[PDB]
Amino acid sequence: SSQIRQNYSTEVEAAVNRLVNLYLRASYTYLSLGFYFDRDDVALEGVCHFFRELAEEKREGAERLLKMQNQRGGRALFQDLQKPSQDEWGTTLDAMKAAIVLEKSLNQALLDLHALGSAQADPHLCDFLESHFLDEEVKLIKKMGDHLTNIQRLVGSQAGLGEYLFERLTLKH
Amino acid sequence: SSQIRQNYSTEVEAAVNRLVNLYLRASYTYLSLGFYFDRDDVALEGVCHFFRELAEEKREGAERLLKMQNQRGGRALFQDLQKPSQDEWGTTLDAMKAAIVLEKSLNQALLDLHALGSAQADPHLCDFLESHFLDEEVKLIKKMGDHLTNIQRLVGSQAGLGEYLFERLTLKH
Amino acid sequence: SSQIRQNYSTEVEAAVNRLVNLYLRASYTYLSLGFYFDRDDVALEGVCHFFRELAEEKREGAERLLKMQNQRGGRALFQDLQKPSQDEWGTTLDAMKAAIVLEKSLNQALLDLHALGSAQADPHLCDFLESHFLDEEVKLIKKMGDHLTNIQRLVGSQAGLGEYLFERLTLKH
Amino acid sequence: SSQIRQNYSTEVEAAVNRLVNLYLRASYTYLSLGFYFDRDDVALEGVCHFFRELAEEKREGAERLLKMQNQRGGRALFQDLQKPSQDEWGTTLDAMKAAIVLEKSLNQALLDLHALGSAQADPHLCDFLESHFLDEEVKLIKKMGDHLTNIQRLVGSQAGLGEYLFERLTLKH
Ligand SMILES: [Cl-]
Ligand SMILES: [Cl-]
Ligand SMILES: [Cl-]
Ligand SMILES: [Cl-]
C-alpha cells in the first residue's frame, strides 16, 4: 500500500478513475470516427486526420490522469470500455456535432471533479486540472465551434461541394 | 536453352507471358487516357499527370515480370498489343470508373496466377506476387476508390465546377 | 458501400474486426500492467517502461489492421473493450508469465486468421499477416521467454534482490 | 513602510515567515544528512549527493518565498534555525524514512497556507503555491516513496549488499 498518500480523498481517487474511463472512451470514439472517414465510400482525409489526432490527445489525457493518480498514492482501477455510440457517423457536420457533444460532456466531468477537489480542499488536484485540462478543453471546443460554423455556412444548396471544400481548405491533409 | 530452370512449370511460364501482355495493354490504355486529358478541349493537367504516372507504373510491372521470367529460366514471348477500348474517355468520372474496372481485371489476373502458383507448389512465384504486386494493387484501387467518391460528391448540379475543383485541389499539378 | 472490395470474404472481414478487439484488449492490459509497476509501493521503472511500450505496440497493430480493413473495402466494427483480467499483477515474474500467455493467445489468433485466409484463397491477407505480424510476434515471444528465464534464475533465495537487479541491469530505464 | 501592499493579510505574512523558517530548517537537516553519508565510515556517495541536492532545493524554496514576501509588501522576519533532530542518521532506509516524514510535514504546511490564502481570498498567494511548490512537493514525495520501496525490497537477509547496490545502481554518482 502507499507510504506517500496525503490529502487525497477516496472520493477524488474514484472520480479520477471514472474520468480515465471517460477519456479512454472518448479516445475510442475518435478512433472509430477517424476510420469511418478513411472508408473508400467516404474518403475525407482531412476529417480522418482530425479525429485520429483527437484519439491520440484523449489517450494522452488519460495517461496523464493515471500518472497523477500514482503520484498521489491512489490506485488506478480500470473498467470495461464501452463501444462508441454509432457504427457510422453520417456527414462531416453530423460528426463535428457529435464531437462537440462529447467534448462538452468531458468538460462537464472536469468541472465536476474540480468542484469536488475544491470542496475537499485538494489544491494539487485543482491545480492539475487547471494546468493540463481546463484551458486545453476550452480551446478545443472553440476550434470545433469554429469548424461547425464553417461547415454550416457551406451546406447551402450544394452539400457535396461544401463538404469537399471544407476538407480541402480548412482541415490539414 | 536454360541450365537453371527448376520447379518452374510451363503453365506458370505461359501465364506470366500473358500477364506481361495485360500489364503492357494497361500501360497503353493509360498512355491514351493521359493524352486525352492533355487535349486543349479537355485541359485537366492533374488528371493527365495521374494517368501518365500509371502508364509508367504498369510498364514497370511488366518489366519486373519479364526480369523474373528470365531469372526462373522461362522464355519471354510477346504478342500483339491491342489498342485501348476507347479513343475518347468522357469525363474525369468516366475515366476513373474505367481505370477501376481495368485495375480490378489486373488484380484478378494476379490472384489467378497466385492460385496457379500455389497449386503447382511454386513458392517463389507466390512470394514474388505478394512482395511486388498484390499490396501495390490493393493500395492503388483504394486510392482510385477514394478519388471516385470525391469526384461523385462534386457532381451535384454544377458538374464543370466540380471537375475543375477536383483536378485543382486533389490531383498533383 | 464499397466500390473496391474484391476477393475479401465476410468471414475474413469479421475475423479482422475480432482481431482488432483482441489487440486493443491486449493494449489495455499492458496499460494496466505499466501503471501497476509505476505504483510507489512497486516502483520498478524498467518493468513499467517495458509494458507501456507494449501497450503502444499493440495499439499500433490494431491501427494497421483497421487500415487494411479499409484498404480491402471491409467495414470496421468496434465492440466493448473488456477490462484486464487483474487489477494487481503480482511480481515481475507473475507479470511476465501473464504477458507470455497473452502473447501466445494473440499469436494463435494470427495463425487462425492466416489459416482462414489460406482456405479462402486470400493471398493479400496472408501476406499482410506474414509481413507485419507473424515474425514480430515470434520475436516478442522469444524476448519474453529470454526475460522469464533470467527472472527465474534470479529468484533463488533472495527474491527482492533478484527483482531489483533484473529491473536495473536487463530492462531499459 | 510599503506603498505597494494590497490584499495581503497580516496572517498570511506571518505564515509566510514561518514557512521560510521551515524550509531553512529542512535545508539544514539535509545538509547534515548529506555530510553524514560522506563520512569515511558510512561512505555512500550517491546518498550524500541526493541529500546535498535537497539541501539546495529547500534553500531555493525559502528564497522564492522571501522574494514573494517582498513583492507583496510584507516584511521578512527571521528566527533562530533549530539544529536537525539527529546527529547520526542510521541506514539509508532510516534516512529516507526521516526525509519522507520531513517532506510530509512541509507539504502539510504548504496545504495549511493554501487554505489560509483561500479563506482570506488571496488568489496570488494560492497561485504562487500551486505554481512553484505543491506539484514539486508531490513529485519529490513520489520519488522518495519509490526509493523507499526499492531500499525495502533490497534489505532481505543481506543488508550491506542491498545498501551498496541501491547506492550504486539507483542513485546518481
Ligand atoms: Cl467486469
Ligand atoms: Cl502475330
Ligand atoms: Cl453494446
Ligand atoms: Cl532570539
XYZ file of C-alpha atoms and ligand atoms in Angstrom:
696
model
C 0.000 0.000 0.000
C 1.041 3.656 -0.362
C 3.501 5.328 2.068
C 3.027 8.688 0.290
C -0.728 9.384 0.214
C -1.583 12.766 1.778
C -4.729 14.885 1.482
C -6.052 12.599 -1.269
C -9.657 11.557 -0.594
C -11.263 8.258 -1.644
C -13.900 10.337 -3.449
C -11.310 12.059 -5.623
C -9.455 8.797 -6.245
C -12.671 7.174 -7.512
C -13.640 10.198 -9.630
C -10.168 10.177 -11.207
C -10.607 6.535 -12.191
C -14.021 7.375 -13.695
C -12.537 10.283 -15.660
C -9.824 7.984 -17.001
C -12.621 5.706 -18.294
C -14.336 8.728 -19.894
C -11.134 9.855 -21.647
C -10.407 6.353 -22.911
C -13.994 6.003 -24.197
C -13.588 9.390 -25.943
C -10.343 8.123 -27.481
C -12.141 5.024 -28.745
C -14.966 7.093 -30.182
C -12.430 9.238 -32.044
C -10.661 6.127 -33.363
C -13.981 4.985 -34.834
C -14.742 8.441 -36.286
C -11.280 8.535 -37.891
C -11.572 5.137 -39.569
C -15.105 5.977 -40.819
C -13.758 8.991 -42.756
C -10.976 6.757 -44.200
C -13.594 4.467 -45.871
C -13.355 4.401 -49.671
C -17.036 5.457 -49.808
C -16.491 8.472 -47.503
C -12.887 9.413 -48.340
C -12.331 12.679 -46.498
C -8.686 12.509 -45.462
C -8.584 15.826 -43.566
C -11.557 14.769 -41.461
C -9.959 11.354 -40.802
C -6.733 13.085 -39.681
C -8.589 15.495 -37.400
C -10.326 12.679 -35.486
C -7.252 10.419 -35.392
C -5.308 13.258 -33.787
C -8.093 13.669 -31.206
C -7.992 9.913 -30.397
C -4.326 10.367 -29.556
C -4.927 13.539 -27.465
C -7.624 11.856 -25.390
C -5.429 8.794 -24.767
C -2.683 11.154 -23.590
C -5.136 12.883 -21.217
C -5.979 9.500 -19.702
C -2.269 8.675 -19.273
C -1.655 11.999 -17.513
C -4.518 11.287 -15.118
C -3.137 7.792 -14.413
C 0.332 9.220 -13.772
C -1.155 11.753 -11.348
C -3.187 9.023 -9.577
C 0.090 7.199 -8.868
C 1.890 10.407 -7.839
C -0.788 10.978 -5.215
C -0.755 7.359 -3.967
C -4.171 6.432 -5.331
C -4.894 3.100 -7.068
C -5.651 3.011 -10.799
C -8.650 0.745 -11.433
C -9.842 0.034 -14.953
C -13.334 -0.808 -16.142
C -14.832 -2.154 -19.416
C -14.554 0.404 -22.232
C -17.944 0.793 -23.876
C -18.001 0.814 -27.655
C -18.802 4.112 -29.383
C -22.435 5.138 -29.717
C -22.523 4.797 -33.531
C -21.024 2.451 -36.132
C -21.438 5.012 -38.976
C -21.125 8.771 -38.333
C -23.036 10.475 -41.185
C -21.727 13.701 -42.687
C -18.815 15.852 -41.561
C -21.436 18.074 -39.952
C -23.028 15.119 -38.100
C -19.587 14.038 -36.890
C -18.470 17.524 -35.719
C -21.789 17.949 -33.808
C -21.266 14.568 -32.114
C -17.678 15.584 -31.257
C -18.844 18.849 -29.625
C -21.429 16.941 -27.572
C -18.724 14.522 -26.445
C -16.336 17.362 -25.590
C -18.986 19.208 -23.574
C -19.624 16.025 -21.560
C -15.873 15.662 -20.867
C -15.662 19.347 -19.933
C -18.538 18.941 -17.500
C -16.752 15.927 -15.951
C -13.592 18.073 -15.497
C -15.626 20.870 -13.898
C -17.419 18.403 -11.606
C -14.068 16.983 -10.476
C -12.629 20.477 -9.929
C -15.638 21.318 -7.738
C -15.118 18.095 -5.745
C -11.421 18.948 -5.336
C -12.336 22.457 -4.106
C -14.864 21.073 -1.629
C -12.295 18.537 -0.342
C -9.602 21.304 -0.092
C -7.345 19.409 -2.517
C -5.427 22.228 -4.252
C -2.998 19.924 -6.060
C -5.933 18.235 -7.859
C -7.489 21.607 -8.636
C -4.161 22.978 -9.988
C -3.556 19.821 -12.004
C -6.886 20.215 -13.824
C -6.339 23.946 -14.346
C -2.824 23.467 -15.729
C -3.364 20.489 -18.059
C -7.090 20.093 -18.889
C -9.422 23.066 -18.471
C -7.807 25.519 -20.916
C -6.977 22.730 -23.405
C -10.661 21.784 -23.381
C -11.907 25.373 -23.830
C -9.503 25.809 -26.804
C -10.616 22.566 -28.444
C -14.306 23.394 -28.094
C -13.672 26.885 -29.580
C -11.928 25.214 -32.527
C -14.811 22.751 -33.013
C -17.353 25.563 -32.800
C -15.368 27.481 -35.443
C -15.363 24.409 -37.710
C -19.063 23.762 -37.169
C -19.907 27.331 -38.238
C -17.819 26.975 -41.414
C -19.321 23.572 -42.219
C -22.829 25.050 -41.681
C -22.182 28.061 -43.927
C -21.034 25.652 -46.710
C -24.107 23.431 -46.773
C -26.257 25.909 -48.643
C -27.794 24.045 -51.619
C -24.634 22.173 -52.728
C -23.786 19.914 -49.803
C -21.240 17.639 -51.508
C -19.283 20.607 -52.865
C -19.212 22.250 -49.431
C -18.123 19.077 -47.652
C -15.249 18.616 -50.127
C -14.142 22.263 -49.870
C -14.096 22.287 -46.064
C -11.971 19.149 -46.026
C -9.582 20.554 -48.686
C -9.235 24.161 -47.477
C -9.746 24.096 -43.685
C -8.505 20.682 -42.485
C -4.824 19.627 -42.573
C -4.017 16.968 -45.205
C 18.148 -23.452 -73.588
C 18.138 -22.856 -69.816
C 20.590 -24.641 -67.460
C 18.905 -23.023 -64.425
C 15.180 -23.831 -64.661
C 13.890 -25.552 -61.501
C 10.333 -26.002 -60.226
C 9.030 -23.639 -62.920
C 6.048 -25.141 -64.760
C 5.117 -24.497 -68.405
C 1.707 -23.361 -67.133
C 3.224 -20.640 -64.967
C 5.640 -19.600 -67.715
C 2.727 -19.123 -70.137
C 0.581 -17.291 -67.566
C 3.498 -14.944 -66.840
C 3.766 -14.090 -70.531
C 0.001 -13.429 -70.630
C 0.228 -11.171 -67.570
C 3.049 -9.231 -69.220
C 0.688 -8.631 -72.177
C -2.041 -7.478 -69.757
C 0.296 -5.023 -67.995
C 1.563 -3.623 -71.284
C -2.020 -3.215 -72.565
C -2.876 -1.422 -69.288
C 0.144 0.834 -69.821
C -1.066 1.641 -73.331
C -4.567 2.375 -72.093
C -3.135 4.781 -69.512
C -0.996 6.478 -72.175
C -4.173 7.128 -74.169
C -6.078 8.361 -71.089
C -3.206 10.734 -70.257
C -3.018 12.296 -73.716
C -6.838 12.682 -73.829
C -6.759 14.882 -70.697
C -3.912 16.938 -72.274
C -6.188 17.948 -75.222
C -6.811 21.697 -75.449
C -10.570 20.967 -75.323
C -10.282 18.855 -72.137
C -7.313 20.514 -70.404
C -7.182 18.854 -66.999
C -3.472 18.702 -66.222
C -3.770 16.884 -62.874
C -5.827 14.139 -64.493
C -3.324 13.874 -67.377
C -0.462 13.541 -64.855
C -2.291 10.889 -62.836
C -2.791 8.620 -65.872
C 0.686 9.250 -67.313
C 2.176 8.147 -63.999
C 0.038 4.984 -64.124
C 1.250 4.221 -67.690
C 4.780 4.264 -66.316
C 3.902 2.090 -63.266
C 2.252 -0.560 -65.427
C 5.221 -0.651 -67.826
C 7.488 -1.150 -64.809
C 5.288 -4.033 -63.588
C 5.679 -5.704 -66.980
C 9.476 -5.250 -66.858
C 9.627 -6.817 -63.387
C 7.653 -9.817 -64.628
C 9.982 -10.177 -67.639
C 13.040 -9.987 -65.381
C 11.560 -12.692 -63.145
C 10.728 -14.890 -66.177
C 14.428 -14.810 -67.110
C 15.560 -15.389 -63.508
C 13.492 -18.568 -63.449
C 14.707 -19.773 -66.873
C 11.410 -19.249 -68.676
C 11.163 -17.730 -72.179
C 9.624 -14.281 -72.667
C 7.219 -14.368 -75.622
C 5.473 -11.227 -76.805
C 2.125 -10.891 -78.533
C 0.305 -8.059 -80.390
C -0.710 -5.257 -78.009
C -4.372 -4.454 -78.547
C -5.290 -0.794 -78.761
C -7.256 0.698 -75.861
C -11.008 0.171 -75.764
C -11.873 3.857 -76.338
C -10.470 6.737 -78.400
C -12.143 9.404 -76.185
C -12.635 8.853 -72.431
C -15.506 11.178 -71.409
C -15.417 12.945 -68.055
C -12.954 12.533 -65.203
C -15.608 10.354 -63.590
C -15.952 8.180 -66.729
C -12.168 7.812 -66.874
C -11.716 6.936 -63.159
C -14.513 4.299 -63.438
C -12.795 2.775 -66.487
C -9.475 2.784 -64.586
C -11.012 0.925 -61.611
C -12.506 -1.678 -63.963
C -9.102 -2.139 -65.587
C -7.364 -2.409 -62.210
C -9.861 -4.991 -60.943
C -9.213 -7.098 -64.064
C -5.433 -6.892 -63.469
C -5.938 -7.750 -59.794
C -7.992 -10.790 -60.740
C -5.209 -11.877 -63.137
C -2.664 -11.577 -60.269
C -4.910 -13.608 -57.958
C -5.464 -16.257 -60.647
C -1.700 -16.569 -61.147
C -1.089 -16.764 -57.382
C -3.633 -19.599 -57.168
C -1.890 -21.415 -60.047
C 1.472 -20.944 -58.304
C 0.019 -22.355 -55.054
C -1.455 -25.355 -56.861
C 1.887 -26.004 -58.622
C 3.792 -25.616 -55.277
C 5.836 -22.728 -56.708
C 6.548 -20.592 -53.616
C 8.997 -18.264 -55.366
C 6.244 -17.204 -57.817
C 3.764 -16.814 -54.971
C 6.250 -14.719 -52.918
C 7.146 -12.617 -55.948
C 3.499 -11.629 -56.477
C 2.968 -10.993 -52.761
C 6.083 -8.824 -52.457
C 5.784 -6.686 -55.608
C 2.186 -6.754 -56.940
C -0.654 -7.707 -54.599
C -0.298 -4.951 -51.975
C 0.611 -2.337 -54.622
C -2.617 -3.225 -56.427
C -4.784 -3.081 -53.277
C -3.305 0.374 -52.448
C -3.920 1.707 -55.954
C -7.521 0.501 -56.022
C -8.130 2.095 -52.574
C -6.742 5.368 -53.944
C -8.955 5.164 -57.054
C -11.998 4.361 -54.932
C -11.207 7.396 -52.749
C -10.954 9.601 -55.856
C -14.154 8.206 -57.344
C -16.079 9.048 -54.154
C -14.746 12.625 -54.180
C -15.498 13.055 -57.886
C -19.046 11.709 -57.270
C -19.696 14.044 -54.328
C -18.648 17.018 -56.547
C -21.004 16.359 -59.444
C -24.070 17.672 -57.672
C -25.730 20.204 -60.023
C -22.541 22.023 -61.137
C -20.517 19.379 -62.950
C -17.942 21.634 -64.638
C -17.145 23.412 -61.370
C -16.706 20.091 -59.560
C -14.488 18.617 -62.268
C -12.230 21.697 -62.164
C -12.036 21.707 -58.349
C -11.133 18.019 -58.093
C -8.343 18.480 -60.617
C -7.047 21.626 -58.834
C -7.342 20.533 -55.185
C -6.946 16.727 -55.151
C -4.656 15.851 -58.088
C -0.948 16.801 -58.226
C -0.125 19.548 -60.760
C -20.894 0.970 -49.761
C -17.529 -0.123 -51.199
C -16.748 0.089 -54.953
C -13.342 -1.565 -54.372
C -13.997 -4.826 -52.496
C -12.513 -7.842 -54.316
C -11.749 -11.347 -53.047
C -12.458 -10.243 -49.466
C -14.814 -12.668 -47.705
C -17.321 -11.761 -44.975
C -15.602 -14.374 -42.795
C -12.239 -12.634 -43.053
C -13.813 -9.208 -42.546
C -15.436 -10.400 -39.302
C -12.269 -12.145 -38.082
C -10.288 -8.952 -38.733
C -12.712 -6.975 -36.579
C -12.369 -9.601 -33.820
C -8.567 -9.435 -34.014
C -8.724 -5.650 -33.718
C -10.702 -6.149 -30.475
C -8.062 -8.633 -29.252
C -5.187 -6.225 -29.983
C -6.968 -3.336 -28.288
C -7.719 -5.510 -25.229
C -4.021 -6.509 -25.160
C -3.098 -2.819 -25.325
C -5.398 -2.103 -22.386
C -3.947 -4.971 -20.388
C -0.446 -3.604 -20.992
C -1.552 -0.108 -19.944
C -2.728 -1.581 -16.637
C 0.481 -3.614 -16.185
C 2.563 -0.482 -16.844
C 0.752 1.693 -14.308
C 0.918 -1.106 -11.682
C 4.742 -1.113 -11.857
C 4.714 2.723 -11.539
C 2.991 2.488 -8.093
C 5.081 3.908 -5.245
C 4.761 0.526 -3.474
C 6.019 -1.440 -6.515
C 8.385 1.091 -8.117
C 10.092 -0.858 -10.884
C 10.597 1.725 -13.616
C 12.165 -0.621 -16.193
C 9.227 -3.001 -15.885
C 6.756 -0.094 -16.186
C 8.546 1.092 -19.357
C 8.560 -2.389 -20.884
C 4.773 -2.786 -20.542
C 3.987 0.804 -21.571
C 5.949 0.237 -24.771
C 3.949 -2.956 -25.398
C 0.641 -1.066 -24.896
C 1.740 1.252 -27.684
C 2.859 -1.619 -29.987
C -0.455 -3.432 -29.606
C -2.437 -0.248 -30.316
C -0.350 0.204 -33.467
C -1.109 -3.393 -34.529
C -4.822 -2.660 -34.182
C -4.473 0.526 -36.270
C -2.658 -1.385 -39.022
C -5.450 -3.961 -39.107
C -8.079 -1.193 -39.302
C -6.183 0.500 -42.135
C -6.030 -2.810 -44.013
C -9.769 -3.436 -43.427
C -10.486 -0.123 -45.181
C -7.974 -0.824 -47.972
C -9.838 -4.036 -48.741
C -13.301 -2.412 -48.588
C -14.400 -4.111 -45.379
C -16.270 -2.287 -42.583
C -14.562 -1.645 -39.239
C -16.955 -2.515 -36.403
C -15.986 -1.934 -32.792
C -17.139 -3.793 -29.706
C -16.894 -3.176 -25.919
C -13.297 -3.481 -24.687
C -13.219 -5.796 -21.689
C -11.170 -4.658 -18.724
C -7.946 -6.547 -17.986
C -8.166 -9.814 -16.078
C -6.388 -8.491 -12.954
C -6.297 -5.219 -11.003
C -2.910 -6.051 -9.374
C -0.251 -8.081 -11.231
C 1.986 -9.596 -8.512
C 5.725 -9.886 -9.072
C 7.733 -9.175 -12.209
C 7.715 -12.933 -12.739
C 3.903 -13.120 -12.383
C 3.542 -10.248 -14.851
C 5.967 -11.673 -17.470
C 4.167 -15.076 -17.290
C 0.807 -13.345 -17.825
C 2.306 -11.403 -20.760
C 3.560 -14.615 -22.428
C 0.122 -16.212 -22.020
C -1.471 -13.145 -23.601
C 1.045 -13.133 -26.460
C 0.506 -16.834 -27.173
C -3.257 -16.210 -27.389
C -2.680 -13.331 -29.850
C -0.270 -15.491 -31.855
C -2.850 -18.258 -32.059
C -5.433 -15.708 -33.282
C -2.982 -14.591 -36.028
C -2.357 -18.207 -37.052
C -6.097 -18.958 -37.084
C -6.706 -15.944 -39.333
C -3.830 -16.928 -41.644
C -5.359 -20.408 -41.980
C -8.761 -18.861 -42.796
C -7.108 -16.603 -45.390
C -5.365 -19.630 -46.959
C -8.609 -21.604 -47.078
C -10.424 -18.628 -48.673
C -7.536 -18.149 -51.204
C -6.942 -14.597 -49.943
C -3.191 -14.119 -50.524
C -3.192 -10.402 -49.708
C -4.485 -11.172 -46.181
C -1.969 -13.986 -45.797
C 0.919 -11.742 -46.984
C -0.229 -8.900 -44.747
C -0.030 -11.115 -41.647
C 3.317 -12.581 -42.716
C 4.852 -9.165 -43.396
C 3.638 -7.207 -40.350
C 2.558 -9.607 -37.556
C 3.862 -13.178 -37.555
C 7.616 -12.508 -37.303
C 7.084 -9.545 -34.935
C 5.129 -11.878 -32.656
C 7.737 -14.676 -32.764
C 10.478 -12.119 -31.891
C 8.496 -10.676 -28.987
C 7.733 -14.094 -27.518
C 11.447 -15.057 -27.808
C 12.328 -11.859 -25.933
C 9.741 -12.578 -23.213
C 10.963 -16.157 -22.886
C 14.533 -14.845 -22.513
C 13.391 -12.434 -19.781
C 11.381 -15.108 -17.989
C 14.441 -17.388 -17.826
C 16.577 -14.575 -16.376
C 13.890 -13.608 -13.859
C 13.587 -17.303 -12.840
C 17.346 -17.751 -12.394
C 17.372 -14.659 -10.091
C 14.680 -15.791 -7.672
C 16.903 -18.227 -5.833
C 16.573 -17.449 -2.093
C 16.767 -13.626 -2.355
C 13.712 -12.651 -4.378
C 13.717 -8.893 -3.715
C 17.390 -8.585 -4.658
C 16.819 -10.520 -7.889
C 13.759 -8.492 -8.862
C 15.691 -5.237 -8.351
C 18.734 -6.470 -10.303
C 16.702 -7.649 -13.297
C 14.955 -4.291 -13.490
C 18.270 -2.379 -13.161
C 20.515 -4.478 -15.429
C 18.239 -6.034 -18.081
C 15.357 -3.574 -18.611
C 15.799 -0.121 -20.208
C 15.438 2.797 -17.758
C 6.894 51.140 5.061
C 5.304 49.613 1.942
C 3.452 51.747 -0.659
C 2.500 48.595 -2.617
C 0.780 46.236 -0.156
C -2.690 45.189 -1.372
C -4.899 42.285 -0.291
C -2.038 40.828 1.767
C -3.180 39.931 5.292
C -1.011 40.008 8.430
C -1.944 36.346 8.933
C -0.518 35.336 5.565
C 2.571 37.498 6.064
C 3.298 35.749 9.379
C 2.612 32.271 7.965
C 4.991 33.004 5.075
C 7.742 33.906 7.533
C 7.069 30.664 9.445
C 7.228 28.630 6.227
C 10.550 30.263 5.367
C 11.843 29.041 8.761
C 10.523 25.533 7.995
C 12.232 25.432 4.580
C 15.516 26.679 6.010
C 15.349 24.090 8.823
C 14.675 21.406 6.171
C 17.700 22.667 4.234
C 19.831 22.396 7.368
C 18.576 18.895 8.073
C 19.505 17.863 4.528
C 22.965 19.422 4.903
C 23.505 17.239 7.974
C 22.160 14.115 6.223
C 24.486 14.765 3.267
C 27.633 15.143 5.363
C 26.737 12.013 7.403
C 26.762 9.875 4.228
C 30.143 11.441 3.260
C 31.776 10.057 6.471
C 34.593 7.583 5.803
C 32.724 5.041 7.976
C 29.457 5.420 6.007
C 30.774 6.254 2.522
C 27.686 6.194 0.325
C 28.367 8.899 -2.245
C 25.046 8.613 -4.115
C 23.128 9.045 -0.871
C 25.310 12.036 0.098
C 24.626 13.635 -3.313
C 20.879 13.045 -3.054
C 20.608 14.865 0.296
C 23.021 17.661 -0.669
C 20.859 18.373 -3.708
C 17.780 18.502 -1.452
C 19.524 20.985 0.906
C 19.972 23.255 -2.093
C 16.348 22.810 -3.303
C 14.930 23.676 0.111
C 17.138 26.778 0.394
C 15.860 27.852 -3.027
C 12.246 27.354 -1.872
C 12.925 29.646 1.082
C 14.457 32.292 -1.217
C 11.412 32.176 -3.505
C 9.119 32.694 -0.520
C 11.240 35.643 0.672
C 11.167 37.188 -2.805
C 7.376 36.828 -2.888
C 7.049 38.352 0.617
C 8.834 41.462 -0.690
C 6.803 41.518 -3.925
C 3.635 41.652 -1.845
C 4.961 44.335 0.541
C 5.262 42.068 3.568
C 8.256 42.147 5.949
C 10.680 39.212 6.075
C 11.426 38.335 9.708
C 13.923 35.630 10.584
C 14.019 33.403 13.641
C 16.618 31.023 15.180
C 17.157 27.945 12.993
C 16.866 24.842 15.147
C 19.509 22.186 14.656
C 18.441 18.929 12.995
C 16.747 16.290 15.122
C 19.623 13.773 14.875
C 23.430 13.923 14.809
C 23.739 10.463 13.151
C 21.114 9.200 10.671
C 21.411 5.379 10.700
C 20.985 3.416 7.484
C 19.929 4.646 4.056
C 16.496 3.285 4.930
C 16.408 5.207 8.246
C 17.446 8.380 6.421
C 14.901 8.039 3.562
C 12.095 7.417 6.129
C 13.137 10.546 8.051
C 13.203 12.507 4.766
C 9.646 11.403 3.872
C 8.420 12.424 7.335
C 10.065 15.821 6.897
C 8.594 16.246 3.411
C 5.090 15.339 4.596
C 5.369 17.985 7.338
C 6.448 20.605 4.758
C 3.623 19.527 2.443
C 1.113 19.912 5.254
C 2.489 23.417 5.952
C 2.001 24.313 2.243
C -1.563 22.965 2.305
C -2.332 24.845 5.535
C -1.065 28.084 3.979
C -3.057 27.475 0.779
C -6.201 27.001 2.889
C -5.469 30.257 4.757
C -4.946 32.046 1.427
C -8.278 30.674 0.132
C -10.101 31.757 3.285
C -8.547 35.253 3.046
C -9.437 35.455 -0.714
C -5.756 35.897 -1.621
C -5.550 34.294 -5.089
C -1.996 35.458 -5.790
C -0.752 33.521 -2.724
C -2.810 30.491 -3.716
C -1.488 30.611 -7.324
C 2.075 31.103 -6.116
C 1.927 27.908 -4.037
C 0.227 25.974 -6.841
C 2.762 27.091 -9.453
C 6.027 26.678 -7.514
C 5.515 24.355 -4.503
C 2.573 21.946 -4.482
C 3.396 19.875 -7.587
C 7.152 19.974 -6.846
C 6.385 18.538 -3.409
C 4.074 15.790 -4.729
C 6.780 14.769 -7.268
C 9.511 14.667 -4.627
C 7.433 12.570 -2.238
C 6.592 10.134 -5.094
C 10.322 9.836 -5.815
C 11.125 9.220 -2.129
C 8.352 6.641 -1.875
C 9.772 4.892 -4.962
C 13.246 4.854 -3.378
C 11.924 3.619 -0.041
C 10.210 0.661 -1.745
C 13.426 -0.270 -3.578
C 15.524 0.083 -0.421
C 12.982 -2.113 1.450
C 12.977 -4.829 -1.224
C 16.824 -4.957 -1.005
C 17.113 -5.500 2.737
C 16.158 -9.151 2.608
C 18.845 -11.086 4.539
C 21.904 -9.271 3.101
C 21.510 -5.679 4.248
C 25.015 -4.397 3.451
C 24.878 -5.792 -0.086
C 21.473 -4.196 -0.684
C 22.533 -0.815 0.684
C 25.599 -0.799 -1.594
C 23.600 -1.859 -4.672
C 20.907 0.788 -4.197
C 23.550 3.487 -3.893
C 25.440 2.194 -6.977
C 22.518 1.416 -9.311
C 19.688 3.807 -8.352
C 21.359 6.986 -7.033
C 23.387 9.373 -9.238
C 27.156 9.295 -8.580
Cl -16.205 -6.760 -15.432
Cl 1.062 -12.255 -84.950
Cl -23.068 -2.960 -26.821
Cl 16.099 35.358 19.642
